[PDB]
Amino acid sequence: QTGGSFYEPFNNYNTGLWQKWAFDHVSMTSLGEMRLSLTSPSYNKFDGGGNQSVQTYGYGLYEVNMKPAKNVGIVSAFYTSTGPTDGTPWDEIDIEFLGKDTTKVQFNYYTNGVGNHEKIVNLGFDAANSYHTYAFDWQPNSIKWYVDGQLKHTATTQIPQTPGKIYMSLWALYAHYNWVRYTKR
Ligand SMILES: [Ca+2]
């Protein structure tokens, strides 16, 4: 990987740490939030709103304090990915919110282009109403997804290994991202 540990409060838009797909996607608020906006076409990428990291990141703790958009059809996401990206394996780890029901969160991952690891977890709260912290601890032999510090799911087989960029996307209305943190453990 090219990137070490960082904390992103989203007070300013750091172009050294992030890049916008389109200047339009993708606006900062006065309350220290990054905002994604979808207007209006499917199916991304890259026909939806999206932000991505400049550097690539590997094993460690990824935390995102966000609020998905609440509307049928749309998907708000936080994920690492190699892209793809031809000449590189498709490795990706996902936190996704289906707008039709923001009381659920979907976990997933891809390794060498093979996903189909969708795990839908009931949150016990509407994710759109307040900020909650969603995380995954990515290590070579396990991914552990957390919601507000509590373990919600564990994957132990076919774990991705290729460092990827950190993405935020809204596709298929606003998704808000309060802060992000990567800890190279
Ligand atoms: Ca913030």
Resolution to 1 decimal place, in Å: 2.4
Contact 20, 14 (CB under 8 A): no
Contact 79, 94 (CB under 8 A): yes
Q: Which two tokens stand for residue 7?
A: 């904390």
Question: What is the number of structural domains in the chain?
Answer: 1
Indicate which residue of 33, 63, 96, 118 is catalytic. 96
Expt. technique: X-ray
Burial group, residue 140, by CB count within 10 angstroms (0-12, 13-18, 19+): exposed
How many Cα atoms are found within 13 Å in the side-chain-facing hemisphere of 67? Answer: 14
d(CA 101, CA 126): 8
d(CA 60, CA 140): 10
Q: Which domain holds residue 80?
A: 1-185
Query: CA geometry: angle at 19 spanning 47 and 139, to 5°?
Result: 95
Task: Report which of 78, 70, 118 is spatially closest to residue 98, judged by C-alpha positions.
Answer: 70
d(CA 173, CA 74): 9
Q: Please report, for the domain that includes residue 162, its CATH number.
A: 2.60.120.200
Ligand 1 mean position to 65 CA, how many Å? 8
Query: CA geometry: angle at 154 spanning 149 and 126, to 5°?
Result: 50
Write the single-letter amino acid at 163: P
CA distances from 176 to 83, 115, 170 (A): 22, 26, 10
Ligand 1 mean position to 9 CA, how many Å? 4
Between strands 92-98 and 104-110, the pairing is antiparallel
Task: Report which of 141, 139, 145 is spatially closest to residue 118, judged by C-alpha positions.
Answer: 145
Asked whether the bond before 45 is cis by omega within 30 degrees of 0, the reply is: yes
d(CA 58, CA 68): 25
Ligand 1 mean position to 129 CA, how many Å? 16
DSSP 8-state code for residue 123: -
Active site residue 8: no
Active site residue 118: no
Can you give the length of the chain in residues? 185
Question: Quick one: which H or E segment has residue 120?
Answer: strand 119-122
Contact 159, 144 (CB under 8 A): no
Biggest CA–CA distance in the chain, Å, is 42
Ligand 1 mean position to 180 CA, how many Å? 8
Indicate which residue of 8, 33, 63, 92 is catalytic. 92
Contact 8, 17 (CB under 8 A): yes
CA distances from 39 to 18, 24, 86, 95 (A): 21, 9, 29, 22
Ligand 1 mean position to 120 CA, how many Å? 27
What is the strand order of the sheet 104-110 is part of? 18-20, 49-53, 165-171, 75-81, 92-98, 104-110, 119-122
Query: CA geometry: angle at 7 spanning 92 and 151, to 5°?
Result: 55
Task: Report which of 77, 89, 86, 88 is spatially closest to residue 52, judged by C-alpha positions.
Answer: 77
Q: Which two tokens stand for residue 161?
A: 């290994």
Residue-by-residue DSSP string for 140-176: TTEEEEEETTEEEEEE-SS---S-BEEEEEEE--EEE
